[PDB]
From Swiss-Prot, chain A:
Family: Belongs to the mitochondrion-specific ribosomal protein mL41 family.
Domain of life of the source: Eukaryota
Gene: MRPL41
Protein name as it appears in the record: Large ribosomal subunit protein mL41
Species this chain originates from: Homo sapiens
Pfam families named among the record's database cross-references: MRP-L27
From Swiss-Prot, chain B:
Transit peptide: 1-54
Protein's name according to its UniProt entry: Large ribosomal subunit protein bL28m
Origin species: Homo sapiens
Source domain of life: Eukaryota
GO terms of molecular function: RNA binding; structural constituent of ribosome
Pfam families the UniProt entry points to: Ribosomal_L28
Gene field: MRPL28
Curated annotation (Swiss-Prot), chain E:
Covered range of the whole protein: 48 to 92 of 92
Assembly behavior: Component of the mitochondrial large ribosomal subunit (mt-LSU). Mature mammalian 55S mitochondrial ribosomes consist of a small (28S) and a large (39S) subunit. The 28S small subunit contains a 12S ribosomal RNA (12S mt-rRNA) and 30 different proteins. The 39S large subunit contains a 16S rRNA (16S mt-rRNA), a copy of mitochondrial valine transfer RNA (mt-tRNA(Val)), which plays an integral structural role, and 52 different proteins.
Phosphoserine PTM positions: 24
Family statement: Belongs to the bacterial ribosomal protein bL34 family.
Classification lineage: Eukaryota, Metazoa, Chordata, Craniata, Vertebrata
Source superkingdom: Eukaryota
Species annotation: Homo sapiens
Annotated compartments: Mitochondrion
Protein name: Large ribosomal subunit protein bL34m
Swiss-Prot record, chain G:
Species annotation: Homo sapiens (Human)
Lineage of origin: Eukaryota, Metazoa, Chordata, Craniata, Vertebrata
Subunit structure, interactors included: Component of the mitochondrial large ribosomal subunit (mt-LSU). Mature mammalian 55S mitochondrial ribosomes consist of a small (28S) and a large (39S) subunit. The 28S small subunit contains a 12S ribosomal RNA (12S mt-rRNA) and 30 different proteins. The 39S large subunit contains a 16S rRNA (16S mt-rRNA), a copy of mitochondrial valine transfer RNA (mt-tRNA(Val)), which plays an integral structural role, and 52 different proteins.
Name listed for the protein in its UniProt record: Large ribosomal subunit protein bL9m
Family: Belongs to the bacterial ribosomal protein bL9 family.
TM segment ranges: none
Localization per record: Mitochondrion
RNA sequence: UUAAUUUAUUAAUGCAAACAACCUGCAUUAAAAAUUUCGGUUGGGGCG
RNA sequence: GCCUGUUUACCAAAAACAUCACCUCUAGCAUCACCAGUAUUAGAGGCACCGCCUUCCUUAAAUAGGGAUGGCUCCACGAGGGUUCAGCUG
RNA sequence: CCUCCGCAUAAGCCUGCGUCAGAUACUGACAAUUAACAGCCCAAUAUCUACAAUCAACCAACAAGUCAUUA
RNA sequence: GCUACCUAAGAACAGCUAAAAGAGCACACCCGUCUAUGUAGCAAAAUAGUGGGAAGAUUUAUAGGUAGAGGCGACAAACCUA
RNA sequence: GCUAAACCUAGCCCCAAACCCCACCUUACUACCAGACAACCUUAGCCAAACCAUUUACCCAAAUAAAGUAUAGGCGAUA
């Protein structure tokens, strides 16, 4: 009778409450006997770096100079990353400069994106 | 408030916008133009003026077409502009009697037709009117190629029209392969209906089919900005070297 | 009758009146007598003569007919050989 | 309604099949037949009404051993599990069919009349005239459809040309090609007439329910009436 | 005796008035469309 | 008598669009749209190959192709 | 084909305008059903000898049923079009 | 309901149409229905 | 009224509806009800299980009660409707 | 002194007498119900399965009663 | 999601008497005979006592189905969200 | 003297002009397995006719005028 409250897994009968989740991503599957098989590769592995010796801190000194925001663009990245090599080889097949014809075959495909964050 | 445009002009406005605007001009003109179908279920007036006997004066007369209902089954067949008449009658044909709902349906037959241009036999649900029209046109191919969209009133008929027109436009050797003389004879027989292939591709397409065709034509995976920037940089370097 | 039509907003004419009455322009309405064509074999010659006559209407009948017709039917008509041309106007009338 | 018929099984089997009651309802969910509903839960035993069904990669007349004779909830007749070669099947049991009996199923129309032993199936052409029969086909190989209820027995009235005249239990004559198979004898459970229901509860167990409004037409049931002609209208209801 | 005609059950509620059943027919789609036009916070039940 | 009533048997696929019967032209289907629409032709999808391979979504080959299949029928 | 006619006359729409139809304009009377018309004959030119009709190159009036079911489908005859008539005339004068 | 009006729809036939099935049109007969009405005078009603 | 049951949710629980039993009418048959049935079947209507044959008494006073194809037969049962003995009781 | 009451599950409800602070089981804030119970299943294709239950042993039947596995 | 009927798959029915029962008495449970209370009530049909059924044509939970001239009806024109 | 009483803009009306991250169809807002059902088909009636039974105006694609005219119509209501 409550049409306004959000539909959660706390509300229906036993089957409803078991079936609905809370947004947690799946980790494996269910076999016969409702035994849950957890797939290791499905579990997000946290790639945490070693922070020993790191100099950066959560905050920045107010003594730091102010600067103008210049959002990075594809043109700027190309100029700062590919243009030098292109000029040096033109003065003297784009895969040599970094371009890849297709994202297929890569672990981290840029589109459709196949990696977290 | 009021709309800037009348609501009945909204479809035309939409046609003048978006992908429908990118649609080819000849197809858009074919959609926009509307011709009254040939009278089928009513007898047209002989002339534009008539001496009505009641007062003996010359009065203008108009032919008001009977609304015809075409069930979706008709789009899979060739009904010669014939369809269901959904109307009403006066019982015993006197206006002072009851008014009854009456549906007149055409007598449908299944017949096999051979298309010379397509070298194929089609089994088509058909009417005696369609058979008579085919006889008057001297064959199924002539009937399909002569009859306009409105008189044909069949999605299957318009698809046959598109197929025949494409065959003629391409002069496709797939018509009787290994018999070029026969193929040329057929094409010469139906020469007068030949049109450019760019136009024959769009014959008989519904608006949604045409939109999908245009979207498929103009769908291109975006060129990587790497290629664009490389071309621009090489062009700029060429200009700098020349200067 | 229809005082305001749905398509023009105009007042309509009751065509039953036009099919039956003649309006003389001065404001007189002429009519035939009821039954003037019915069972003449059983009517006396005097009764038939009375029935074959064109007859004027009352003041209230005329007012009703005027209300039931529009101004088009109350105009001057200059027909070629109208038999009622002389009757369209009143002469030597005192009040 | 989301009604799907329970008669979906495609492969013949001996195992009783769980059958769903209808209640007299169409697939539309509306009552089509009144007076049906409830009753004891039943399981359906698929009856092979084509008695001459030679086994796979086999042909010719074959014999079968009556494994057992059983009550069938879905029929007036009792059924017989009968086994031949390497298969078992349910057939309609005849009056004196017993466990361990032997049954013959033949397609051979002998020139002479075959000795008609109760329970075996022969083409109607092979039977003597006047023999009691049951499980009669209408067409050769169609499968038995007539004379199937308990204790029923048609009579092979006549045989001329390739056509036989059968007297159905309703005492109506039927013409069937003599190549159509029928089994000899009357159907079993011959005392089905004499069973007394005794109480309304037993009918309710059998799945018959008391139902009213069985006609659904305006005014309900209305017996046919003779509409008098105009000359006869003057005498329809003459007063005393 | 009367008044308690509502005997709640979420299965029946969702199966009878839910979004899926509303969309399952053109009439229910028009129900949802009317609620959207009116601005109802709750389109379906 | 055949077992299995029609209403329970798998429904026959709808008849092919007449556009597929006309030799020279390519039908316009909703395959490009990646979803069904009722006013476009129904695509003819090639059979999908990578399907019956995953262990939890596996289809066994027909009995004829099994390694121990033998024409002579044993009785176990 | 069923040919129908309005019981109620439709008022004239004009030149560029479309007639406005009301409920009474959907009442029709059947003036004729073409299927009940007497059968006519189809003019065909024969290409192969056919029993009791002709031999070849001769214009024949055949029942529409025969013409559309046997002669034309089997190639025994061709439509009596002007082109076919001319071609068979050239054949006749070349023989 | 033996009130009036219909038979659009089904079901039968018949005649045309398509070459037996199936189907279209036109009729006729039914079933099922549908629409509509309940004048005036005489304490009321019956018969008037 | 055969019986057990059912019914006017919210003024009627009954003699009404149903019911076994019986009768009548209709139907010779397959793949969605009837029915995965086939005349000992199915559908509809009627009827009512069954079985057989064809002025006096009561009170003192009693408009109350009981007794001198149909006709009949009440075994049992009933919060049915009447009557009564005795007892019991504000 | 009283109760066919109580405790649990289901279904339903959704924080609705826990703590604190303001009011007169209200308002606000803070806290809380931890899976073993329960739900959420099954890799398919074929082929298999006549033999009730009722202490299931005698006796007692008819209304004839899902139990789906194996290569 | 009431109610009427139905479908699928469940569940309940002490004790005594009797013996395989639409059996008897009588709990739970279902109902609603009669009386009283109540009558803006605790209640838009309740309470108390009494009473009928209570292994069945029983009662009942869950899910599904039949929709308005329609459904459903052991026919009361009953019931289909007071 | 209590309860009250009063207020003015919050907005609204009619014109003109102008054409206007993630989740979610399964029990919606639910990361993740064999599809295929996929839509189209005269409005009726209230009402007027003082009942009613034929009939009884209704986004039309230039306002005005022709003209409530010609016509239609239980030739009547009306159109
Ligand atoms: Mg309930
Ligand atoms: Mg004009
Ligand atoms: Mg009784
Ligand atoms: Mg009783
Ligand atoms: Mg009551
Ligand atoms: Mg009562
Ligand atoms: Mg007394
Ligand atoms: Mg007990
Ligand atoms: Mg009992
Ligand atoms: Mg009931
Ligand atoms: Mg009654
Ligand atoms: Mg009126």
């Amino acid at each position: 009778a409550d049409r306004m409250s959000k539909w959660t897994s706390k509300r229906g009968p036993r089957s409803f409450r078991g079936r609905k989740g809370r947004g947690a991503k799946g980790i494996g599957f269910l076999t016969s006997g409702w035994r849950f098989v957890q797939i290791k590769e499905m579990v997000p592995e946290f790639v945490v770096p070693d922070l020993t010796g790191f100099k950066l801190k959560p905050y920045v000194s107010y003594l730091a100079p102010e600067s103008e925001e210049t959002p990075l663009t594809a043109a700027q990245l190309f100029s700062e990353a590919v243009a030098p090599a292109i000029e040096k080889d033109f003065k003297d097949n784009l895969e040599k400069y970094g371009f890849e014809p297709t994202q297929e075959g890569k672990l981290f495909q840029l589109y459709p994106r196949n990696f977290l964050r | 408030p009021l709309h800037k445009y009348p609501v009945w002009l909204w479809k035309r406005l939409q046609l003048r916008e978006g992908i429908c605007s990118r649609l080819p001009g000849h197809y858009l003109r074919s959609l926009e133009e509307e011709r009254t179908p040939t009278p089928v279920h009513y007898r047209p007036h002989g002339a534009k003026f008539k001496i009505n006997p009641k007062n003996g004066q010359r009065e203008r007369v108009e032919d008001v077409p009977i609304p015809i209902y075409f069930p979706p089954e008709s789009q899979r067949g060739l009904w010669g502009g014939e369809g269901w008449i959904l109307g009403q009658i006066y019982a015993n044909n006197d206006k002072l009697s009851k008014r009854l709902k009456k549906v007149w349906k055409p007598q449908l037959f299944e017949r096999e037709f051979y298309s010379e241009i397509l070298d194929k036999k089609f089994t088509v649900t058909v009417t005696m009117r369609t058979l008579d029209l085919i006889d008057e046109a001297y064959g199924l191919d002539f009937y399909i190629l002569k009859t306009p969209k409105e008189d044909l009133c069949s999605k299957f008929g318009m698809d046959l029209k598109r197929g025949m027109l494409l065959r003629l436009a391409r002069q496709d050797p797939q018509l009787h392969p290994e018999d070029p003389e026969r193929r040329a004879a057929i094409y010469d027989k139906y020469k007068e209906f030949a049109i450019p292939e760019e136009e024959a591709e769009w014959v008989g397409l519904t608006l949604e089919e045409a939109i999908e065709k245009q979207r498929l034509l103009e769908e291109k995976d975006p060129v990587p900005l790497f290629k664009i920037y490389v071309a621009e940089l090489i062009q700029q370097l060429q200009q700098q070297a020349l200067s | 009758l229809t005082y305001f039509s749905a398509r023009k907003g105009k007042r309509k004419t009751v065509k039953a009146v036009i099919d039956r009455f003649l309006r003389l322009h001065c404001g007189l309405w002429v009519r035939r007598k009821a039954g003037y064509k019915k069972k003449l074999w059983k009517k006396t010659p005097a009764r038939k003569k009375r029935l074959r006559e064109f007859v004027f209407c009352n003041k209230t009948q005329s007012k009703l007919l005027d209300k039931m017709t529009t101004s088009f039917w109350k105009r001057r008509n200059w027909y070629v050989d109208d038999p009622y041309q002389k009757y369209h106007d009143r002469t030597n009338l005192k009040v | 309604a989301n009604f799907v018929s329970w008669k979906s099984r495609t492969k013949y089997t001996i195992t009783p099949v769980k059958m769903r009651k209808s209640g007299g309802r169409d697939h539309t969910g509306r009552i089509r037949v009144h007076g049906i509903g409830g009753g004891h839960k039943q399981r359906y035993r698929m009856i092979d009404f084509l008695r001459f069904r030679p086994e796979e990669t086999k042909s010719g007349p074959f014999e079968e051993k009556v494994i057992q004779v059983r009550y069938d909830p879905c029929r007036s007749a009792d059924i017989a599990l009968v086994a031949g070669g390497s298969r078992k099947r349910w057939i309609i049991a005849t009056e004196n069919m017993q466990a361990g009996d032997t049954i013959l199923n033949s397609n051979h129309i002998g020139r002479m009349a075959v000795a008609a032993r109760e329970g075996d199936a022969h083409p109607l052409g092979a039977l003597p005239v006047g023999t009691l029969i049951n499980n009669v086909e209408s067409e050769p190989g169609r499968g038995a459809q007539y004379i199937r209820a308990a204790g029923t027995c048609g009579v092979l009235l006549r045989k001329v040309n390739g056509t036989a005249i059968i007297q159905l239990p309703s005492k109506r004559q039927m013409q069937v090609l003599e190549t159509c198979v029928a089994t000899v004898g009357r159907v079993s459970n011959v005392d089905h007439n004499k069973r007394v229901i005794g109480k309304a509860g037993r009918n309710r167990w059998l799945g018959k329910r008391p139902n009213s409004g069985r006609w659904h037409r305006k005014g309900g049931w209305a017996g046919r009436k003779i509409r008098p002609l105009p000359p006869m209208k003057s005498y329809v209801k003459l007063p005393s | 005796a009367r008044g308690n005609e509502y005997q709640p059950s979420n299965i029946k509620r969702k199966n009878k008035h839910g979004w899926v059943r509303r969309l399952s027919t053109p009439a229910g789609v028009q129900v949802i469309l009317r609620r959207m036009l009116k601005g109802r916070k709750s389109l379906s039940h | 008598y055949e077992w299995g009533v029609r209403s329970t048997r798998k429904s026959e696929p709808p008849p092919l669009d007449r556009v597929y019967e006309i030799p020279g032209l390519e039908p316009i289907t909703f395959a490009g749209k990646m979803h069904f629409v009722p006013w476009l032709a129904r695509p003819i999808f090639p059979p999908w190959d990578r399907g019956y391979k995953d262990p939890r979504f596996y289809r066994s080959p027909p009995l004829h192709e099994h390694p121990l299949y033998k024409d002579q029928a044993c009785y176990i | 084909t069923v040919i129908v006619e309005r019981w109620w006359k439709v008022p004239l729409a004009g030149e560029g305008r479309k007639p406005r139809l009301h409920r009474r304009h959907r009442v029709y009377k059947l003036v004729e059903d073409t299927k009940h018309r007497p059968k006519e004959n189809l003019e065909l030119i024969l290409t192969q000898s056919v029993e009791n009709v002709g031999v070849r190159g001769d214009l024949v009036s055949v029942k529409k049923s025969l013409g559309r079911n046997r002669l034309l489908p089997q190639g025994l005859a061709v439509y009596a079009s002007p082109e076919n008539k001319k071609l068979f005339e050239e054949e006749k004068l070349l023989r």
